[PDB]
CSV table of N, CA, C and O in Angstrom, one decimal:
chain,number,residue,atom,x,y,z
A,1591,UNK,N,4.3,14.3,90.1
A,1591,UNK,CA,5.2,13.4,89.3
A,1591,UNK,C,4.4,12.5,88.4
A,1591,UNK,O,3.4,11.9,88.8
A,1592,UNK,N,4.7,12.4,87.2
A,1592,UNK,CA,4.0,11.4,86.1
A,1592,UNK,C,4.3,10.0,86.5
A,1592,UNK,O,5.3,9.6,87.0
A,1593,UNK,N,3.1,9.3,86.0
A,1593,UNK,CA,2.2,8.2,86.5
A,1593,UNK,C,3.7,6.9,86.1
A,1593,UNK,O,4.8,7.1,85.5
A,1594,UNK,N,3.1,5.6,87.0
A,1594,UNK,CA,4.4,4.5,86.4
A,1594,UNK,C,3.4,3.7,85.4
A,1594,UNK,O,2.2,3.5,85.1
A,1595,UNK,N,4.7,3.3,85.0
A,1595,UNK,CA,4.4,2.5,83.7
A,1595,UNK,C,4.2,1.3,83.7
A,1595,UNK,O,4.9,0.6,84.5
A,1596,UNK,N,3.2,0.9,82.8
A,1596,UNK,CA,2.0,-0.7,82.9
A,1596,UNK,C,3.5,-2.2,83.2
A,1596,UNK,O,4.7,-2.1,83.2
A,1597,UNK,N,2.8,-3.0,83.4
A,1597,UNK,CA,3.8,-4.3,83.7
A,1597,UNK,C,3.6,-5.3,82.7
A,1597,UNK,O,2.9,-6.3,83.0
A,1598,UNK,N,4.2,-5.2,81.6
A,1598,UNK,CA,5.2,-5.6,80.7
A,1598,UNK,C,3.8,-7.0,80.0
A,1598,UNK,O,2.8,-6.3,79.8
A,1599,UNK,N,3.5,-7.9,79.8
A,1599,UNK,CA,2.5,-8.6,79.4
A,1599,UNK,C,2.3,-10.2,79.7
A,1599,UNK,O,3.1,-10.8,80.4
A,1600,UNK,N,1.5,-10.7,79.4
A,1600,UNK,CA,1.4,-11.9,79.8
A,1600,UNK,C,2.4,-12.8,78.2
A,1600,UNK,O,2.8,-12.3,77.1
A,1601,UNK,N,2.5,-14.7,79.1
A,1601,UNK,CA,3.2,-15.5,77.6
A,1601,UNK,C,2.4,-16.3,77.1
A,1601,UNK,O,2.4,-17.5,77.5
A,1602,UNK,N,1.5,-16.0,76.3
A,1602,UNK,CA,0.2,-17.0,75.2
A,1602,UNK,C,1.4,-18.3,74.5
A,1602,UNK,O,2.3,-18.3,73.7
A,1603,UNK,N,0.6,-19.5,75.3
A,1603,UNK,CA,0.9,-20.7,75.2
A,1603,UNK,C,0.0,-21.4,74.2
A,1603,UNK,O,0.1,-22.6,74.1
A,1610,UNK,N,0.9,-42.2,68.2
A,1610,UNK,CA,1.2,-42.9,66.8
A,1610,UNK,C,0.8,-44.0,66.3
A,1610,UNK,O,-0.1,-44.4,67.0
A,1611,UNK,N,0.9,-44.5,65.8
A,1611,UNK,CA,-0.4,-46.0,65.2
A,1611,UNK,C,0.1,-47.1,65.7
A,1611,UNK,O,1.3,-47.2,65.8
A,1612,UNK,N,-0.8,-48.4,66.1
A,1612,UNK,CA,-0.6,-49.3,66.5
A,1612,UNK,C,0.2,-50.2,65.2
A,1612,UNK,O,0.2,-49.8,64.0
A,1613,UNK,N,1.0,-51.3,65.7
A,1613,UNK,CA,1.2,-52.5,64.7
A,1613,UNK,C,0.6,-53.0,63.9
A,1613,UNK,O,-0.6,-53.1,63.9
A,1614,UNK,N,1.2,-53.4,63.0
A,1614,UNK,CA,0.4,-54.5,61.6
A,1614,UNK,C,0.5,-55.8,62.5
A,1614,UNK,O,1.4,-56.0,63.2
A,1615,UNK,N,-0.8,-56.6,62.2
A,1615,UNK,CA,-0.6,-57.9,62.8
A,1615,UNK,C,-0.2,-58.9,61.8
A,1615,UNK,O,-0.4,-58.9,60.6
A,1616,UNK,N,0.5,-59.9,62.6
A,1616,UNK,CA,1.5,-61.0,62.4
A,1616,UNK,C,1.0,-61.5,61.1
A,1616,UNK,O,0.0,-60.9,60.9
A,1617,UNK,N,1.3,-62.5,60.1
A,1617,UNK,CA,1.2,-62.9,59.2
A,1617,UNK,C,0.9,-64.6,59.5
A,1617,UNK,O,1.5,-65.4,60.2
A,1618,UNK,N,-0.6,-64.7,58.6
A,1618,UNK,CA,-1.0,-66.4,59.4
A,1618,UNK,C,0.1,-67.3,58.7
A,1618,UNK,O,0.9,-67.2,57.8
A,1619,UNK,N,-0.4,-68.5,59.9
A,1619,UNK,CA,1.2,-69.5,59.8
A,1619,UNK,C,1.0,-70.3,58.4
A,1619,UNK,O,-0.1,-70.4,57.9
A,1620,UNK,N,2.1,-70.9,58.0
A,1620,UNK,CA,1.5,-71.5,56.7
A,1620,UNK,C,0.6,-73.2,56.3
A,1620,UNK,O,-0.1,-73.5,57.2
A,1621,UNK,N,0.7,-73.8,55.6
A,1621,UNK,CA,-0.6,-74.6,55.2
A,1621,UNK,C,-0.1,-75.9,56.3
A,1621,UNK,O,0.9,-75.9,56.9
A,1622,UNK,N,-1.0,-76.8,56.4
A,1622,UNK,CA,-1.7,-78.1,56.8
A,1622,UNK,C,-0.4,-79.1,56.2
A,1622,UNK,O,-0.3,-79.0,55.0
A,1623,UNK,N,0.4,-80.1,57.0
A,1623,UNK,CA,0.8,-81.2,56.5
A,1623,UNK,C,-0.5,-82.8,55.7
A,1623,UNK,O,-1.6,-83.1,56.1
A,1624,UNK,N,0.3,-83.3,54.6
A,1624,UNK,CA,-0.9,-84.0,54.1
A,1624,UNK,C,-0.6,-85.0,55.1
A,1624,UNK,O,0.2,-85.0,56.1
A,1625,UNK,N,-1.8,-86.4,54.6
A,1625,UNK,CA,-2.3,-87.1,55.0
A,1625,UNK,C,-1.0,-88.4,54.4
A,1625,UNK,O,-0.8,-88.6,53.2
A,1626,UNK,N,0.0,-89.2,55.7
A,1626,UNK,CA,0.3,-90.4,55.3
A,1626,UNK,C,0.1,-91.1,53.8
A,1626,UNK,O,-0.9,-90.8,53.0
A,1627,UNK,N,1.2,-92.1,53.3
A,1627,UNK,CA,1.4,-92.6,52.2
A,1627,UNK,C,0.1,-93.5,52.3
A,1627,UNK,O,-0.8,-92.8,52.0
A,1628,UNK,N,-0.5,-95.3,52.6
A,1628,UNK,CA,-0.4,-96.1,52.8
A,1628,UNK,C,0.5,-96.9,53.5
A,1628,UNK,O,0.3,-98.1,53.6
């Protein structure tokens, strides 16, 4: 009887944040 046949085959197989924005300027210095 002829041979069996082979078995079928094998199966071939984000950026961090921007940082915060600095806070804004210094209050002045009293009237007199």
């Amino acid at each position: 009887p002829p041979p069996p046949p082979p078995p079928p085959g094998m199966p071939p197989t984000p950026p961090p944040p921007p940082p915060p924005p600095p806070p804004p300027g210094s209050p002045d210095q009293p009237s007199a």
